[PDB]
């Protein structure tokens, strides 16, 4: 029970930080009126 | 004199106010097929087309953005990233761009004039006014702008008051 | 010209616009001692006397209707069952009546054009506009009207727009 | 003639209306470092400084009061308790003070003109208009006033209607 709780908290927190970093990557690039995404930050953050 | 008339001629149809029980508290911006609108200004869009949409949010950059349809993308503002230092046109006259900072002389500035874009001598939007802070005699602006790479940079001085 | 001015003189007294938050969405008509209001138009009637009256609804004919107070009964429009072909009047110029179809030359008729009573060559209401469609170079309308028996008749062309 | 101009010159900056979806229903009063505002008038304060406060209530005396800050206490109305009988200045002309009662001639008086202070020939507030009752030809007022001891006396005739 405690190992499943530790693993659950760790996976949920890592997924939360991943979504936080994806938002932090794509927030400056979406407010621009040109609406383009560069080559590296498109595929690595699933931006399309 | 004629600068305010040019601002009223350029921002006539493209600028829509935000109503809140009859009070004008902010102004949206239609540029690049995008509808910029701040967080702290809360109310209904005076335009009927722009009100029936869904705006994606960005609380860190203090911007709500949406997708303007294709039948209105030609009637938008212009935008650029190449900007030298000196003078620019604003709705209440002139604004100084010094050391990468927008400064407005005192006397003007209250609650309600948030979202007015900053124009140049050609007719392109270089910044969007979001807040202001009183600095001695000459106030500074907390705005957003773009760059050559394409990253929306939000400039915010110390202890600003939201308008 | 000349026709629209007496219609403005009539509409200044008895045709009442509705009050959406900043604009006008539709027009309540007071005819024969029975207040009429379209359904898709939502807001508040300008008179505090006509606001408090609860309306009965008729979804087949797209009109709320309520009873007019006794003082207001003499200051109502008049209604006519008999309409011959030709030209009738309207707030936006003239309207053609041909084969039982109120049609209008295009360029006019948009949102906020609802409940405007089509008058006649005497000053009596023959129809109430609820919307229309652009039939090529000339738009037709979707009105309710009356006949010889006393039966409210609604006509609506194909794919009309609720104005 | 000139009395209404003197009322508009004295009550220009110190009188703030109360807004309710664009409707003017009442007027507050800034006197003695205090903000008087009635109960039945509900809405938002047009001034930005006076709206962001907390008003202590008194339902028996029908008054909400607050503390005006020190940077605005010099720009208030004046107040006194020494009043003789006769005539006084009001926003719609003159008002008679007879037997300790304020009377206004008919023709004027509706819903919305609540909270207007009564001035004298020197420029001091002697009463605050809260309600009125129609008495024959000459209406009476239901107001508040002060005395020599310092007790706020609320005068209310029979069967008044709140404005």
Swiss-Prot record, chain A:
Highest taxon above the source species: Viruses
Post-translational modification note: Palmitoylated via thioester bonds. These palmitoylations may induce disruption of the C-terminus transmembrane. This would result in the reorientation of E2 C-terminus from lumenal to cytoplasmic side.
Membrane topology, record value: Single-pass type I membrane protein
Lipid tethering residues (S-palmitoyl cysteine): 25, 45-46
Subcellular location: Virion membrane; Host cell membrane
Spans traversing the lipid bilayer: 1-17
Cytoplasmic topology ranges: 18-48
Function as written in the Swiss-Prot or TrEMBL entry: Plays a role in viral attachment to target host cell, by binding to the cell receptor LDLRAD3. Synthesized as a p62 precursor which is processed by furin at the cell membrane just before virion budding, giving rise to E2-E1 heterodimer. The p62-E1 heterodimer is stable, whereas E2-E1 is unstable and dissociate at low pH. p62 is processed at the last step, presumably to avoid E1 fusion activation before its final export to cell surface.
Subunit comment: Interacts with spike glycoprotein E1. Processing of the precursor of protein E3/E2 into E2 and E3 results in a heterodimer of the spike glycoproteins E2 and E1. Spike at virion surface are constituted of a trimer of E2-E1 heterodimers. Interacts with 6K protein. Interacts with host LDLRAD3 (via domain LDL-receptor class A 1); this interaction mediates viral entry to the host cell. 2 adjacent E2-E1 heterodimers in the trimeric spike interact with host LDLRAD3.
Name of the protein described by the UniProt record: Spike glycoprotein E2
Parent-record interval covered: 706 to 753 of 1254
């Amino acid at each position: 029970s405690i190992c499943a709780a530790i693993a659950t908290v760790s996976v949920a927190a890592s997924t939360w930080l991943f979504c936080r970093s994806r938002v932090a990557c794509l927030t400056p690039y979406r407010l621009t009126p040109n609406a383009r995404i560069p080559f590296c930050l498109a595929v690595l953050c699933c931006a399309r | 004199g004629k600068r305010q008339r040019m601002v009223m001629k350029l921002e006539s149809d493209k600028t829509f106010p935000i109503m809140l029980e009859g009070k004008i508290n902010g102004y949206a911006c239609v540029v690049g097929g995008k509808l910029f609108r701040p967080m702290h200004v809360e109310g209904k869009i005076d335009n009927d087309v722009l009100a029936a949409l869904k705006t994606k949010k960005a609380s860190k950059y203090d911007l709500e953005y949406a997708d303007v349809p294709q039948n209105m993308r030609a009637d938008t503002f212009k935008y650029t990233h190449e900007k030298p230092q000196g003078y620019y046109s604003w709705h209440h006259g002139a604004v100084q761009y010094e050391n990468g900072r927008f400064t407005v002389p005192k006397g003007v500035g209250a609650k309600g004039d948030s979202g007015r874009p900053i124009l140049d001598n050609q007719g392109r939007v270089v910044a969007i006014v979001l807040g202001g802070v009183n600095e001695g005699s000459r106030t500074a602006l907390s705005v957003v702008m773009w760059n050559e790479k394409g990253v929306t940079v939000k400039y915010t001085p110390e202890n600003c008051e939201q308008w």
